[PDB]
Structures are given as structure tokens and as C-alpha cells.
Enzyme design. Structure first.
Site, PDB file in Angstrom:
ATOM      1  CD  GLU A 304      -2.335  -1.632   2.748  1.00 43.09           C
ATOM      2  OE1 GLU A 304      -3.698  -1.714   2.676  1.00 43.09           O
ATOM      3  OE2 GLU A 304      -1.742  -1.478   3.876  1.00 43.09           O
ATOM      4  CB  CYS A 399      -9.085   2.388   8.870  1.00 42.35           C
ATOM      5  SG  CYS A 399      -8.666   1.681   7.182  1.00 42.35           S
TER       6      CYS A 399
END
Lengths: 635, 635
Positions: A304, A399
Site C-alpha cells: 500500500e 478504517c
């Protein structure tokens, strides 16, 4: 400084966070959503407080989900008291206080699942990260409600952390694999005045990347031999070299931007020029070489992460919602370090594009990944499987939601900055602020239909007349801004410094400043080193980046060519996507009918004209699954 | 049918295979290369024959490396006897004979490492695949040398395999996870006349994909529970459904093409119309929807596999050298099933592009993967790490070499096909053939500088004058092909059927056919559904696809635009890349300057003119590391 929102655009989002997002997450955190992957987030604190029985469940950083929900709730309570919501928060807070160990340690995983094993895996197990998130929530909750209980609990943990980590005798010369504690400690310092917190933040930042590597030392002590899964090793955590020697953004994007956000805060507070320059160098690298036009960052699913300069592929982008939120946080600290409109320009880009793109307009579903090009069938490729073609609910790393909630709910905190030198307007958002300039009370009102229109009316009302400076951002996307004061033109050109117009004069009750920012449709081009966008163009109007969707234009959006001369128009559609400006014009497609089931041919393709319609990027994927592109082929 | 190569192009490659490639591999197989990964490929047979001691070493399919080297050596011996090389082969062969079990089984891994455990993991352990490769080598070695020993050995194994596998009492209703045995068995049938081999091939193909799944049954028996690593499950092995329900190419590309190759051979030999149609449907899917302009196949590194229609990304392509070789094998059986020039067109596309692209011109280094677009810095991305920017040596799966060697060495076998109703010319290669048509002895000579020029002179000399048919492929890339017989132009239009001109007449001694295939520079366009190539164009001349390299054009090949009206020119460069035609012209680049380090700008790009030079795709990466593209942006 109290700020009230009085707009349509952000007010609608806050309402969504308040009525849909935060209540839904509360249910999830308490395992009351039948079809959901259980969270056990609250339950873990119950067990830890000795008020329930059972095994720890969930991710090692599960505690931070509770923190983020509390932090958002804090911001919600600043803009509308709700005794029930406040009661829920108070009870959670008392529960945290009962789960807290006598020495100040608060962590469910190392209280229930691996008692006694605390601080042995900072690289992976997020102890300081969770502590940081809880600190942020406690600071926020204090500022919102005046209630100190949560703040007291978290100061005990912050003090304990201060005894454990450092260069001193018997201390661990460590830091977390996921940065966060550093920026959180600054906030805790700002609200308490306790310099230990400021120094501890500085310690964590200065120690990162020092040899011999802390992560190698703790790894060795665990008896672990396996190579780290991420090929760049400690670049993933930006712990490869000391922060002042980092001249490129590398590794995991959220981690990086949280670190930068701390570095910028510390450069400001400590007057540390070397750190300031490191920040500026990293800022330029991220925002001029490794950022998407949407404010997305992170070009590789694997880790990521950042890759390298100008590698910004649209179809394989990661551009995680959380990274774009983190960019917003960073910009705010950069602004405290140096008043430059380019910082707020980025903040605004992220805010109106790659952050809110992370949610459906009604707040019920989310993206983790925010692509700039989607062909849904192709999302079955292994190298595109991180790209979800429609938004969904999440679990485990859910999240995207309490993360977007905490930003949206605090949007009011980003509009204005009161300094002793000036009152700065960063964002053009219908709102008012009651503040103090040169010890005097001043009320400022903004009326504007921004982002749909570039006319802004500021009414400035000091309690009594007085000289002070109003700093107004001139948006970098804008050409030809115009300003009038009580109906008279003002030459702003000599007043502008680094993208802010400094207006210093004696202000009287009912003074009116009119700002006019022309919003033509612009064709945006990427630097030629951005290989993914060679021969392509993006549409933008004001701060809003546009996209084309299949629902409006048909499939095969790669086979749409926008001629340079095509005449583009914009107009408002009140009933579309909560009310948006759309952009229309005439493009060209290659004729497939003229094709003959051959795959390759030496023929000149025949082209025909089609109308197109573009909508705001943030609003894509609210009308079903389909293709989408931002960067369209040119001519 | 004896065929002699008399050209420059293929002869140079055969010489490289004979003097560099095969000798180097012989050393590797015997572990005599200091700085290589050891192979033990020969040593495993020694141990298995009881002539040496030690443990098994290498991959479960290590035995096939020996087979592929022998098969190539066989083809080398057809075009130049070499008693030393023949001796090496003979010794290896006697060794295989001594490693063989009394029942016919020959497999080192299941003789030394897991005695008695044979036939328990056909999904993964390649037993039939290795047997198949050994069979192919034995057939080839018999045809080349007349020596039957290797053939006798392999017939014993093939007979044994026939007792073990089938639908009969006590038989395993199984098949290999890597197809190969099926096509190998057809070759063994052709050289022995033993119908069991033909039926066994048919059995393996008819059984694949039948429920309940064989691979689930053996998996269960091993006590294995883990899910298969490839997400599509048995699609990887094309064992998801029966072959005659497979309408799309899926899974691992080499596996698929070996299967299709067997299917086509069986459809021909058994007169099975349902299998013929299945082959045709697959052919159309592969070659009209899932093939790169280079003849590459395989668009996903994960599983080295097909994806789906029109998904042909240039930068993340897999296009394994072995898959393109396998496509060549497939096309040869398709041609036996139905005489259609489109088959030979693909054969030629692979032969002159994506096969030989797999080696450096001097045969010392290889590619596994054959990309169509390279930015070397970007090869550090996880999603591009399979793309090597320069060729190298390989180990473990060092198939690129003995695999290319066997094809190149046997190139003579692909030029002509003698049927009872015609002699067909598939490839235009300087050569001659002595053959029999309608019982009459006929000598045919081809003289041509193909592929660099489209003029071919065929001299046709029958022993005595007589009527027969010459079938000449009219290449699908060509327009305006002309044919002249003894200086008179012949109207071919009425003679053409499915891409072959049928020339039937009375032939006399010294008759001369002149073929002229114009080779202009062509701009090739991909079907509009090919998203990757929207707005791009590829250059091709004759059968050769061209590319741009950095060494000739500078960096940032994405920022090169080829206008539709740019004048292109081709000429021969005798001292470049072993002697190639190059293509030259004037393209446009966008000027970096108007950005001034901004990443995104609302400005009209300024373009300037630059020269460009394009070279054959196969010959890229012989002049050092650098950018390369096939599909260039158009303006």
C-alpha cells in the site's frame, strides 16, 4: 475560536456522519450487526477490565477503532450536543479507565492474549499506534466537552510510555512500525503544556532509522529469522535511514504521511530548520512527483505504498482513503510551518476528491482503494484484485469509515487559522467564526456556493473598529481572482505572498469583502514524465476533478477521445447526485461496427461523434457498477 | 520428404543453437558450470540406474530437461551428423535404459526419493509430462538417426502407462496437471502405428474435467486440505469442465496450448467433428481475443495465464517464451485439421516475433517473459517484477533455452506439408525439398531474402512432366500478392481458398514460379475493445513486428507520438543486429519545459519534432538496458 458551518456541501456530509456512519459503527463495535464479521472491539476492553470472560478477538490494532470512533464523536458533539451520544462516550471512557493497568498501560491484546509480552514487537503490533489514536481521541473529547477524565487516563499512559522508551538507562531505544504516536503526542502537548510529551515525540522521530536497527534488535530477541515480507525491508516503515536523510517518499503511504505530519509539527514547535527543510523536500517529492490528480497517494497495492517519481498508473492505483485523509492532516501542519497557498491547494484537492470519494453519498458503503480508472471485468486480474468496482462495508481493517468520519466531522477546524499576525481563510465554505484578533472579538461570516461557484462574500464585524490582517488564499487552480471591499476594487497583486492575499486595514462593523474566482472548465495535463497519462487529459472545474462513467457514456471509456477544440460547458443539475455541476461536450469514438472480428488490422480507424457527460470524481459509483475514467484520451 | 535449409536467417539461428546453446546446456545438465545453480539432471538417472549414490536433487520435472536437450540434439543431427554429439546422446540413452524399472516406469524422483509413491500426485508432480517429453525426444531421435533403442525404451513406458490409466477395471481415471503426454502419444503413434497410443491420448483428453474431479479424489487420498493457490482453481490446468465445453482459453498458457495441440491432432486422426469444432472455437478465442501482436500469449504473471478477451496490457504482459513455442506446435496440427492460411499466419507471427525474442542474437542469454513495453525503473514494481529488463541465464525452470533450441533446430519441418492431393508451402524460407506428389518424384527450390523482402522464386522440377497442385500461402499481412509462372502473371484470385493459392497445372522441368508479396510499412491498429492500445499504433513490415528502443530514440518512449501522415521509410542495415531492415521517420514529443516542475497544469502542450528509428521486436535488448515500446501513441 468557535466555527459554525453554514453551508450545503459539508453540512450534508456531517449530517450523514452523525445519523448514519457513527451510529452504524457503534453497532459494529458492539457486535450487534447480524451479518457482519464480529469486531469484539468493546468486548475486548470488558474482558480486560475483568467485567467479562472470553478470548481476545480481532486484529492487534483493534483498540484503535474504538479510539477513532470516540474522536469522531467528540467532533460531532462540538457542533451539536447530544446527551445520549455523550453518555455512550462517557461510559466507554470509564470502561477504558477500568481496563487500564496500574502503571498506565492500556492495551487489550497484551492484557488478555499475551500478558507480560508487551513491548516485544513494536515493528508489527501497533501498541504505540493504538496509544496515539486514544490520545487523539482524549484530546478531542476534552476540547469538545470540557471533560478531562479521558485526558487523565491517556496522560497516565503517555507518562508510562515516556518511562519505557528513550535513550536512557533501562529504556527501549524503540519506536512503532506504524507512526502515529508522534503526531498524537504533539496534540497532547498543545492541550496540556507538558513538555515531556513534546520531547518524547521528538525522541521517536529522531531515533527512527538509526543504526543498529531497533527492529533488528527486537526481531533477534524474539528468535525470528524469516526475511521481512516487503522487499524494500524497512522502507515500508520509513525506518531505513534517519528522517532528515529521507529525500523521497517511500513505503506505506499512511505510515509515511503520519510521520511527515509529526515532523512538520516538530519543526514548527522546535524551530528546527533541518527538520523544516526535510519536510519541504518531502512535500515537494510527494505532491509534485508521487500524487494523483485526485489527491490520492500510493501507487502500489503491494505494501500500500509509494513507488517512485512519476509512477502513477490509474488502473492499478492504490490511493487508499486513509492516505488521502493523512495528506490532509499533513497539509495543516505544513501551513503552521509556512503560510503557502500550495499547501492549502493540496488540502483542498484531497478534501473535494480523493477523501470523500471513499464513501457513497449516503454514507452506507466505502472504498478502501480509490482508483482513477475502472474496467470492472479487469478487476479479476490478480494485479487489480485490490480494486473493488463498487463500495461496500468493511471488517477487520474497517478504517475507511471511522477514519472518514473523524475528518468530515472536524472539517470546521480546517477552514480558518488564527495567528497573532493575521486571520487566514484556507477554505471557501459557507460558515462563520467568532475569534479574537489583537485581544478583540471579531465575527467573520462566509457566504458562498463554492465549490459550484467561485463568488465568496465575507462579512467582517469587529466588536469595535480596528486594524488587522485578513489572509485570503488565492487558489492555485484559479486564474484572475478579483476582490472588492465595500464595493470598491482592490489591487491584490501587490498584496499576495505565496498564494495568500494579505489585506491589512482598519475594519469596521459590516465591512464586506467580495471574492470572485472564475471557474472555467479546464483541461489538465500531467507532466510528460507521467507515463500513464501520455496522450491523456483530465477535466477539472474549480477544485473538483471530474470523471466519465459508463452509466452516462456507455462502455469502453478507453475508446473515447476528447478533441482539443471541443467546446465544453458546465451547468448545475439539482437532482443529480445530491446536486452537482456536470460538464458536457462532444467527444469521438472509434467505430467497432466497421471492425470485422479481426484483432489486428492495418486500417485507418473510422471515428464518429458522441455527446459526453462528466461528473465529479467523488460522486462516482453511486449509480451502479460500471466503467469510470479520469484521464481521457486526447484528440 | 527431405528438406534442406539454404537461407541466411534461420541458418544463423541453427548455428547458434548448435555451437552455443546446446553445448552450454550439456554442461549445465552435468553440473560443470562453476557459477550456476546445480541441476543434477543426469546424476539423478545415474543414481536411479544404481550407478551412483546420493540423494535426488532438483524439481520434480527435472527429467524433462534431459528429454528436451535430446530432442533438440536429434533435430541438429538431421541437418549435420556429428559422431561426438551422437555419442553423447547414445550414452545418455543407454543410461535411461538402465534407470528404467522392470515394468517400464522411468522417473528418477519416484525411483530414488519416493519409491512406491508413483501416481499419487498427478496434479503437481509431472510424471506423465516428463514421460511425454521423453517420448517426443525418442521419436525425434529415431527419425534422425534410425536408432531405435530410445524408442524401444519409451514404448515400454507408454505401454505401462496404458495399463495404469483408463476407465477399465483397476485403472486410474486420471491425467496430468500439466498436459503434454497427449500430444506426445500422437507422435509415438505416428512413428509406430500402434493404435493403443492413439486411444490412450484420446482417453486422457476425454477424461479431463469429468466429475467427480480426479484431482479432488487423489487430493483427498493424500490427506490434503489446503485450497489450491490459484484462485480459478482447476481452470489453471484446464480441468474445470470437459474439453468440448471449453469455449474460452483459460489458465496457464503453456498447459492450455499443449492440450489444444493434442485436441487438434486427435480431431484430425479420429475424424471427430465435435473436437474439431471445439479446437476451432478455441483457436478463434486465443488468436482473435487473447493474443499479443508478437504472437505472445499469457496476460497475467499470476499463474502465467490467460485472463479474458481483449485484456492485453503491454507493460504487465507475461507472454512466456514457451507459450509462444507452444502456439507454433498448435498451429502445425491445426493445419493438418484444415488448410487455412490463418493458421500459418499465426505460426509465422510467433516464429519471427515472440519466440526468437526470447534469446539474445548470440544465444547466450534468454527471456522467460516477453513484454511489449518496458520502463526499466518500473520493473521494481511488484506487479512488474516478472519483467526482466535484460536477458539472462536461468536455473530450475531453465526451459527458455532447450525449449527454443528444439524449435529452431526443427524449423525445416514447418516449411512444407506434403499431402496426397497437394504440396503446400507454409513458410517462405530459402530451402529445398525432395518429395513425392501423386507417386511422382518432385524437387522444389525456394530462393528468397524473406523476411527482409517479399520476392520468392520457386523452381519446380518433376522427374517427368505432370499435373499436380502446389498450394502457396498468401500471407494474411499482405495485400496485392502477385504470382508469375514462367514470366507470365497469373490471376490468383480464383485460385485462392482460405489463404492458399491452389496452383494446379502440368509442371515441366525448370518451371519457375515467382511470388511477390509487397512489404510496405504498415500501421497496425488493435480492435477497439483492446483497452491497452486505445490511441496507439504498432509498426509492422512483412511478418515482422517492430519496436522503438531508447538506445535509438532517447528515454520516455511514452512521450513519443507518431502522426498518421508521417512519412515512413525502410532500408537494410547490414551491420546492425546481424543485418536487419530498420524503419525511420519523424515523430513528435511533448516539451517538458512548460510544466516547470508542476505535476498537473491547465496548459496546451507544446510539441516538437524528433527523428525515430524502429527495429524488429525480436532484436530488442541486444544493445543494453533501456526503454522499449511496440505500441506507440498516435497523433
Amino acid at each position: 475560536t468557535n466555527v459554525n458551518l453554514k453551508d450545503q456541501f459539508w453540512k450534508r456530509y456531517i449530517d450523514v456522519v452523525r445519523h448514519e456512519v457513527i451510529p452504524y459503527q457503534w453497532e459494529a463495535l458492539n457486535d450487534r450487526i447480524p451479518d457482519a464479521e464480529p469486531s469484539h472491539a468493546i468486548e475486548n476492553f470488558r474482558i480486560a477490565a475483568g467485567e467479562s470472560d472470553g478470548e481476545f478477538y480481532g486484529m492487534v490494532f483493534q483498540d484503535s477503532d474504538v479510539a477513532k470512533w470516540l474522536e469522531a464523536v467528540a467532533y460531532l458533539l462540538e457542533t451539536k450536543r447530544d446527551p445520549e451520544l455523550e453518555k455512550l462516550a462517557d461510559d466507554v471512557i470509564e470502561l477504558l479507565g477500568r481496563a487500564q493497568q496500574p502503571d498506565g498501560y492500556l492495551n487489550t491484546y497484551y492484557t488478555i492474549k499475551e500478558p507480560g509480552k508487551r513491548w516485544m514487537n513494536l515493528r508489527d503490533n501497533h501498541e504505540l499506534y493504538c496509544a496515539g489514536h486514544l490520545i487523539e481521541a482524549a484530546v478531542a473529547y476534552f476540547r469538545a466537552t470540557g471533560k478531562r477524565r479521558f485526558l487523565d487516563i491517556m496522560c497516565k499512559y503517555a507518562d508510562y510510555i515516556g518511562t519505557v522508551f528513550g535513550r536512557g538507562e533501562g529504556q527501549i531505544p524503540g519506536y512503532d512500525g506504524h507512526q502515529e504516536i508522534e503526531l498524537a503526542l504533539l496534540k497532547l502537548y498543545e492541550v496540556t503544556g507538558n513538555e515531556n510529551y513534546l520531547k518524547l515525540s521528538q525522541y521517536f522521530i529522531d531515533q527512527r532509522g538509526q543504526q543498529p536497527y531497533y527492529f533488528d534488535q527486537e526481531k533477534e530477541a524474539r528468535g525470528e529469522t524469516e526475511p521481512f515480507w516487503y522487499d524494500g525491508g524497512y522502507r515500508y516503515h520509513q525506518a531505513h535511514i534517519p528522517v532528515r536523510e529521507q529525500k523521497q517518499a517511500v513505503g506505506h503511504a499512511v505510515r509515511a504521511l503520519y510521520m511527515y505530519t509529526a515532523m512538520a509539527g516538530l519543526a514548527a514547535k522546535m524551530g528546527d530548520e533541518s527538520l523544516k527543510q526535510a519536510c519541504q523536500t518531502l512535500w515537494e517529492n510527494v505532491t509534485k512527483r508521487q500524487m494523483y490528480i485526485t489527491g490520492g497517494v500510493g501507487s502500489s497495492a503491494f505494501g500500500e505504498s509509494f513507488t517512485f517519481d512519476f509512477d502513477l498508473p490509474n488502473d492499478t492505483a492504490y490511493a487508499e482513503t486513509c492516505a488521502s485523509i493523512a495528506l490532509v492532516f499533513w497539509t495543516r501542519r505544513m501551513l503552521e510551518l509556512e503560510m503557502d497557498g500550495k499547501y492549502a491547494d493540496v488540502m483542498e484537492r484531497a478534501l473535494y476528491n480523493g477523501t470523500i470519494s471513499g464513501m457513497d453519498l449516503d454514507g452506507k458503503k466505502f472504498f478502501y482503494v480509490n482508483p482513477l480508472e475502472v474496467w470492472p471485468k479487469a478487476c479479476e486480474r490478480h494485479d487489480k484484485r485490490h480494486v473493488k468496482p463498487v463500495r461496500q462495508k468493511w471488517f477487520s481493517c474497517a478504517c475507511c469509515p471511522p477514519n472518514l468520519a473523524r475528518l468530515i466531522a472536524s472539517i470546521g477546524h480546517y477552514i480558518y487559522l488564527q495567528t497573532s499576525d493575521a486571520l487566514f481563510v484556507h477554505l471557501y465554505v459557507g460558515s462563520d467564526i467568532q475569534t479574537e484578533i489583537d485581544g478583540r472579538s471579531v465575527k467573520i461570516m462566509q457566504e458562498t456556493n463554492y465549490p459550484w461557484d467561485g463568488t465568496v462574500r465575507l462579512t467582517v464585524s469587529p466588536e469595535s473598529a480596528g486594524e488587522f490582517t485578513l489572509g485570503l488564499r488565492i487558489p492555485g487552480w484559479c486564474r484572475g481572482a478579483e476582490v472588492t471591499i465595500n464595493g470598491e476594487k482592490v489591487d491584490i497583486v501587490p498584496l499576495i505572498k505565496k498564494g495568500y492575499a494579505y489585506i491589512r486595514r482598519v475594519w469596521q462593523q459590516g465591512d464586506e469583502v467580495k471574492l470572485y474566482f472564475p471557474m472555467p472548465v479546464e483541461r489538465i495535463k500531467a507532466h510528460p514524465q507521467v507515463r500513464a497519462n501520455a496522450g491523456k487529459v483530465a477535466l477539472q472545474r474549480g477544485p473538483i476533478v471530474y470523471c466519465l462513467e459508463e452509466v452516462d457514456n456507455g462502455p469502453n471509456l478507453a475508446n473515447l477521445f476528447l478533441p482539443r477544440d471541443a467546446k465544453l460547458e458546465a451547468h448545475f443539475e439539482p437532482d443529480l447526485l445530491e446536486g452537482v455541476v456536470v460538464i458536457t461536450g462532444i467527444a469521438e469514438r472509434v467505430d467497432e461496427s466497421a471492425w470485422n472480428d479481426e484483432l489486428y488490422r492495418p486500417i485507418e480507424p473510422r471515428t464518429y461523434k458522441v455527446p459526453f457527460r462528466a461528473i465529479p470524481y467523488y460522486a462516482w459509483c453511486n449509480r451502479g457498477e460500471g466503467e469510470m475514467v479520469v484521464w481521457v484520451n486526447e484528440k
